[PDB]
Amino acid sequence: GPGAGTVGGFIKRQQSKVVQNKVVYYGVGIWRGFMDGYQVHLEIENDIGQPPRLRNVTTNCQSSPWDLSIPIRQWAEDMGVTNNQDYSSKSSRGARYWMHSFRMQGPSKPFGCPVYIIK
Ligand SMILES: CN1CN([C@@H]2O[C@H](COP(=O)(O)OP(=O)(O)OP(=O)(O)O)[C@@H](O)[C@H]2O)c2nc(N)[nH]c(=O)c21
């Protein structure tokens, strides 16, 4: 169901180390791929010990980017990525939507992760 067909991968891998026989990721990661035919760019970040946070969504889906909320939520579930953190003061101007709790709102609700549209 959700996320069916999503394909992509990290173009910028997070930094990593092995702690207690487990890999731990930290720093900035950039994932790029396709969802429903559209290009999607997702950035995550965390310090060592904090779960990765969704800090940027960029897509070429201009006509209905809200249709990406379900596959982004599923991608994030698979990855352990959270969407509670507010990046509104740390983001470049030009966001067209904001994602928080994996739901999308328009520019009058600037809280959470910015959603940029590029084509
Ligand atoms: C680079 N990776 C890989 N990875 C986790 O490992 C899964 C498989 O990643 P992969 O890109 O297929 O393999 P890869 O890490 O390149 O393996 P290898 O380099 O040993 O060949 C990913 O779906 C994800 O769960 C990651 N998870 C987080 N949070 N951040 C990251 O940068 C990365």
Residue numbers in the entry: 1704 to 1822
Excerpt from the publication:
As demonstrated for the influenza virus polymerase complex, the bunyavirus L protein is assumed to bind to cap structures of cellular mRNAs, while an endonuclease cleaves the mRNA some nucleotides downstream of the cap creating a short RNA fragment. This capped RNA fragment is subsequently used to prime viral transcription.
RVFV CBD crystallized as a dimer, which is not fully symmetric, with a buried surface area of ~430 Å2 between the monomers. In solution, the protein appears to be monomeric, as revealed by size-exclusion chromatography (S4 Fig, buffer composition: 50 mM Na-phosphate, pH 6.5, 150 mM NaCl, 10% (w/v) glycerol). The structure of RVFV CBD consists of a β-sheet formed by seven β-strands, an additional β-hairpin as well as a long α-helix. Thus, m7GTP was present in all crystallization setups and additional electron density corresponding to an m7GTP ligand was indeed clearly visible in both chains of the RVFV CBD structure. The phosphate moiety of the cap structure interacts with R1716 side chain, which is extending from the loop between the first β-strand and the β-hairpin. Further contacts with the m7GTP involve M1782, interacting with the guanine moiety and ribose of the cap-structure, as well as Q1717, interacting with the guanine moiety. Isothermal titration calorimetry (ITC) measurements revealed a KD of ~737 μM of RVFV CBD for m7GTP, which is considerably higher than the KD of 1.5 μM reported for m7GTP binding to influenza virus PB2. In summary, changes of the chemical properties of side chains directly interacting with m7GTP in the RVFV CBD structure mostly result in selective transcription defects in the context of the full-length L protein.
